[PDB]
Design a binder for this molecule. Structure first.
Ligand SMILES: O=c1[nH]cnc2c1ncn2[C@@H]1O[C@H](COP(=O)(O)O)[C@@H](O)[C@H]1O
Ligand SMILES: O=c1[nH]cnc2c1ncn2[C@@H]1O[C@H](COP(=O)(O)O)[C@@H](O)[C@H]1O
Lengths: 186, 186
């Protein structure tokens, strides 16, 4: 089985390919920007994205929308983690959290999958907290400031294998794969 | 630092050496034949090649394999792109594609790297479509019938600079370097 992953994020590609490759599934990345609507849930962005993409890209295909939700900031940046990352950056997040009595936050990943006129969503959530300073150079995005619950290292201090074993994306991929096993040949 | 590139393709060595040399990495070609297995996935050819080369060549070392995958032909010629080009040729591909409305296809490159007891893979993909006729005299192989997404010209109608900016191998090399920059000292 070969799945087309519509994304422009190389980090997501490596993580998804590493996870599913373990089971003999091939991932073929396809950069094709799609509208990412403003909405309350990552699930809404994925629903609109699949509806938009169908008929314009090869099947079966998958997309992924993820975000960091900081408790003391009422869930911000959340669905708009990308814009915030590219504007105020990690430095901005740390500045906002200066003196915070609660640095907890959760990362969430939502994978959209489409095949033969059927759409599905799988997701995963990993709780943790924001570090006081950037640490590590592995991974991407907010990895240098997110410490998953139970760990002493930020995602950026972990290998891709270690990150996948604990991350929101690894969890979404597990949910997806468990579904695949009882539905499709692979 | 030095990386041994196990290959007998002069043009490929030049491309890889030129790219990685930009970042102080010295590519040293080693003409050591190795088994390229029959497989549907470039990843399997690379995995087997690396596993076979282990202990037979100096480290760290890399190998690469790529191919053209045509949607309407179930991915053919894919891993067998070279052989198909030498036998049925571009004439054969166009013949098979006669009447096909869906002419989508993609070039995919997979780089394999071995260092400190572990193997790593990196990929690059360039989407496009198969033309209705051969055009251009630049490049090689399937370039005369492949039009990259976003362009009207076939790879053969482009200068080396224009093609390189859209190259699937170039993308694989970029991914490989981003990994090297974070994982190795030099
Ligand atoms: O595993 C992750 N580590 C760090 N940042 C991530 C991760 N997953 C998603 N992001 C960030 O959340 C934003 C993702 O984009 P989106 O999927 O379009 O919502 C990007 O800014 C990423 O940097
Ligand atoms: O940019 C390209 N143009 C034309 N053919 C290509 C290109 N990249 C890969 N190929 C085909 O795939 C072959 C195999 O590749 P290699 O393992 O990358 O050396 C070549 O023999 C070509 O037939």
């Amino acid at each position: 089985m070969k799945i087309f992953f519509i994304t422009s994020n190389p980090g997501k590609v490596r993580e998804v390919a590493n996870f599913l490759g373990t089971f003999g599934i091939e991932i073929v990345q396809l950069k094709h920007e799609y509208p990412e609507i403003q909405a309350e849930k990552l699930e809404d962005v994925v629903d609109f994205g699949i509806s938009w993409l169908k008929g314009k890209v090869p099947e079966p295909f998958m997309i992924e929308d993820s975000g960091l939700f900081i408790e003391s900031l009422k869930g911000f940046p959340g669905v708009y983690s990308s814009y915030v990352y590219r504007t105020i950056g990690l430095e901005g997040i740390l500045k906002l959290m200066e003196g915070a009595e609660d640095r907890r936050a959760y990362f969430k990943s939502v994978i959209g999958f489409y095949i033969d006129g059927k759409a599905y969503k799988f997701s995963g959530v990993t709780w943790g907290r924001i570090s006081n300073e950037k640490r590590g150079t592995h991974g991407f995005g907010y990895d240098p400031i997110f410490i998953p619950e139970g760990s002493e290292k930020t995602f950026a201090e972990m290998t891709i294998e270690e990150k996948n074993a604990l991350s929101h994306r690894g969890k979404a991929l597990k949910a997806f794969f468990e579904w695949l096993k009882v539905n499709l040949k692979y």
